[PDB]
């Protein structure tokens, strides 16, 4: 049917959705799992505590929140069923699966079983007439307008660098490490663990998330700043927990650029980044070093771009200067790219008709996946 098609978006931490023509996703709904903390003594309650937004802000007693897609790695699907089901419910867009075609993206480096399960939902349970699955960085490029450029971005729990010229990219040259903000939250609470505070469940995790994105910044000289002295400002929770932080308020690049110092096995964004750039054509590499699409919904801290510049200076063929790109907010660019995507001729040659899915399914999914 020629109605406005549904454009569902994704996200390990913040998942979006919309229509081909929306300029704003009506809901900035996070990616999580609402649950009870204890066995509800009385039956016939808010089944599974499927809470969204104000419903999540309703109560806190028997409410344990989780993630149904850990760092992009989704494991179960019942949570996803209820989440999508809630979106399908006439409180989000008040539409149906059949009433509008659906556009959607997927994170790379995933088994096909994820795609299998999702399409099974979208065509068996719900019925999409025409669907599609794409990438994310491409949509961000369309939002920025560039079609070329060394694309780079980092989600809530997924980081990835893709070298691109006119959309072209080599899979070998494409790099991705799925570790971001969620573990930074885990380490913020671990810092406070050394500091001796409250550690019992996801509530504190939410608190720490509010801290991470609110009462947290990033400095530039951790050795100096570690040897410096501050009075460590505090915050006020619903209890009013006047708690001091200090270096731990900005000890995140020892997770970004130096996570191995947490006795871990990784490299550093800039390293893998430059390596992927080095996988390209040396001279084309040099040209693209002047246009490196920088993004990331979690990389929202000042001075870190300068730290990245320091990595650049330590790695660039010196005197070939590369200054700081400082894009502050990086979320809806993918959503915007998807809106522009479905708004064009694209989906007409790029849909997944339900009929073809009925005929083949995974065969059609992968024959049309590229």
């Amino acid at each position: 049917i020629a109605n406005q098609p549904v454009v569902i978006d994704n996200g390990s931490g913040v998942i979006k959705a919309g229509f081909a023509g929306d300029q704003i996703p009506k809901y900035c709904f996070p990616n999580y799992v609402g649950r009870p903390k204890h066995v509800r003594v009385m039956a016939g309650a808010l089944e599974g505590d499927i809470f969204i937004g104000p419903k999540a802000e309703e109560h806190r007693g028997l409410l344990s929140i989780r993630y149904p897609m850990e760092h992009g790695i989704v494991k179960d699907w019942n949570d996803m069923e209820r989440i999508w089901q809630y979106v399908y419910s006439k409180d989000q867009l008040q539409t149906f699966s059949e009433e509008h075609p659906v556009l959607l993206t997927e994170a790379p480096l995933n088994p096909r079983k994820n795609r299998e399960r999702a399409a099974e939902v979208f065509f068996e349970t719900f019925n999409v007439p025409a669907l599609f699955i794409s990438m994310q960085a491409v949509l961000s490029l369309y939002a920025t307008g560039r079609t070329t450029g060394v694309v780079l971005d980092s989600g809530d729990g997924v980081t990835h660098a893709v070298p691109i010229y006119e959309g072209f990219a080599m899979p070998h040259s494409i790099m991705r490490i799925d570790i971001a903000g969620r573990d930074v939250s885990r380490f913020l609470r671990l810092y406070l663990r050394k500091e001796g505070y409250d550690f019992h469940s996801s509530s504190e995790f939410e608190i720490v998330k509010a801290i991470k994105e609110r009462a947290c910044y990033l400095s530039i000289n951790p050795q100096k700043d570690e040897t410096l002295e501050t009075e460590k400002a505090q915050y006020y929770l619903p209890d009013g927990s006047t708690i001091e932080i200090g270096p731990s308020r900005f000890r995140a690049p020892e997770l970004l650029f130096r996570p191995d110092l947490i006795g871990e096995e990784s490299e550093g964004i800039h390293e893998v980044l430059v390596f992927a750039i080095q996988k390209s054509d040396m001279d084309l590499r040099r040209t693209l070093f002047s246009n490196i699409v920088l993004s990331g919904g979690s990389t929202l801290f000042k001075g870190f771009g300068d730290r990245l510049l320091s990595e650049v200076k330590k790695l660039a063929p010196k005197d070939v200067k590369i200054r700081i790109s400082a894009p502050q907010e990086r979320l809806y660019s993918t959503w915007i790219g998807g809106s522009i995507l479905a708004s064009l001729d694209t989906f007409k040659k790029m849909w997944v008709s339900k009929k073809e899915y009925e005929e083949d399914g995974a065969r059609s999914i992968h024959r049309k996946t590229f």
């Binding site: 480096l109 995933n110 088994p111 079983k113 080599m170 070998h172 110092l261 006795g263 096995e265």
Partner: protein, 370 residues
């Protein structure tokens, strides 16, 4: 009388003249453990090596000390050396002349540095370094033969004629099974399995050797696999996980025939060897079909001989009678050939003593090593 030490970026062996079994057999990889920041007691070695590192592989990360002949650190290499000597033989180097190998494409400064430190650190009476292929055909029993090396990170086609040969005729591509290990590990990652450390590499190279058989046409083999999944054999790891693969097994060494799996802008092993044959005399090429000698440790996979045979069979005319020399012991045969080389007195009259570098410097390395 001598000091036979076969080398390799992986397999490094040792013994003496007349010995048939290499006394030293170990992975010549450098293990570096998770040196963290908190305190600990009773210590350990700074960095265990190979077997030492494999013993405690859970912390030790056996990174590569060499890279297709590119030795990372000479110091670590010497640590390997010294400990291996005082691990296996515990004999001083002043006893006899040493025996080591190398391969071409190497900048002369490396072999000079090598031998230079060999006299520095060890003060051996004399010494010698050669080419593996020489020992290969030398142990084979010919002076006219074309072989190819497929080690852990090397590949080279050496045609010989009555001992004579040509560097122009001898071709080389230092690419081997390590790349396949990378490819295999990432495709199994796509299948849904975690792979971060070096132990991942060890287990995958293990099962890689355990399953890289050689079929003929992946189209029909793939058709049969998708038809009957009986070929998709299962295997349970040291951990409870049991994987099932059928295509993966034999299709992983297909990249040797096709750089397309990696996009290397290169040629197949068969046609590369064919071009090596093309750089010859019309009469001796026939002898190459007769002296179709095979080597390399990464050629311990059944089926490829018939494959390569059929390849060149389609290439060369019917009159070119193929006679494949396929020794399933080519891996250790180089060390053995070194022992046999160490048995011919005239060769042991030819030496590289102290005074040659003491006075002559390292130019005799260029005109005396080979």
């Amino acid at each position: 009388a001598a000091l036979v030490v076969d080398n390799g970026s992986g397999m490094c062996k040792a013994g003496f003249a007349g010995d048939d079994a290499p006394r030293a057999v170990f992975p010549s990889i450098v293990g570096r453990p998770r040196h963290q920041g908190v305190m600990v007691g009773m210590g350990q070695k700074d960095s265990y090596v190979g077997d030492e590192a494999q013993s405690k592989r859970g912390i030790l990360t056996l990174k590569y000390p060499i890279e297709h002949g590119i030795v990372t650190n000479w110091d670590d290499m010497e640590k390997i050396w010294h400990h291996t000597f005082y691990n296996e033989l515990r004999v001083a180097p002043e006893e006899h002349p040493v025996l080591l190998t190398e391969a071409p494409l190497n900048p002369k400064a490396n072999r000079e540095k090598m031998t230079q430190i060999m006299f520095e650190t060890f003060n051996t009476p004399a010494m010698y370094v050669a080419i593996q292929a020489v020992l290969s055909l030398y142990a084979s029993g010919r002076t006219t033969g074309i072989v190819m090396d497929s080690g852990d990170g090397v590949t080279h086609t050496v045609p010989i004629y009555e001992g004579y040969a040509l560097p122009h005729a001898i071709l080389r591509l230092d690419l081997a099974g390590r790349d396949l290990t990378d490819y295999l590990m990432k495709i199994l990652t796509e299948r849904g399995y975690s792979f971060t450390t070096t132990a991942e590499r060890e287990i995958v190279r293990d099962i890689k050797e355990k399953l890289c058989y050689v079929a003929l046409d992946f189209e029909q083999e793939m058709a049969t696999a998708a038809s009957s999944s009986s070929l998709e054999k299962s295997y349970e790891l040291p951990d409870g996980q049991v994987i099932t693969i059928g295509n993966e097994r034999f299709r992983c060494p297909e990249a040797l025939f096709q750089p397309s799996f990696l996009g290397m802008e290169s040629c197949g092993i068969h046609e590369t060897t064919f071009n090596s044959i093309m750089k010859c005399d019309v009469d001796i090429r026939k002898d190459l079909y007769a002296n179709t000698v095979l080597s390399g440790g990464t050629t311990m996979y059944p089926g490829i001989a018939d494959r390569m045979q059929k390849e060149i069979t389609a290439l060369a005319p019917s009159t070119m009678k193929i006679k494949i020399i396929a020794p399933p012991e080519r891996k250790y045969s180089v060390w053995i050939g070194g022992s046999i080389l160490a048995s011919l007195s005239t060769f042991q009259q030819m030496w590289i003593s102290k005074q040659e570098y003491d006075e002559s410097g390292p130019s005799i390395v260029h005109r005396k090593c080979f």
